[PDB]
Amino acid sequence: PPGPPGPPGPPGPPGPPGPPGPPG
């Protein structure tokens, strides 16, 4: 019969940049 499932894949990439801070 088939072998076991493979391991989990690699982590996804970093997320997008955060929003700008509030005015000065």
Residue numbers at the binding site for its own copies (CB under 8 A)? 1-24
Give the type of residue at 17: P
Measured distance CA(17)–CA(20) in Å, rounded = 9
What does the chain look like in DSSP terms, one character per residue? ---PPPPP-PPPPP-PPPPP----
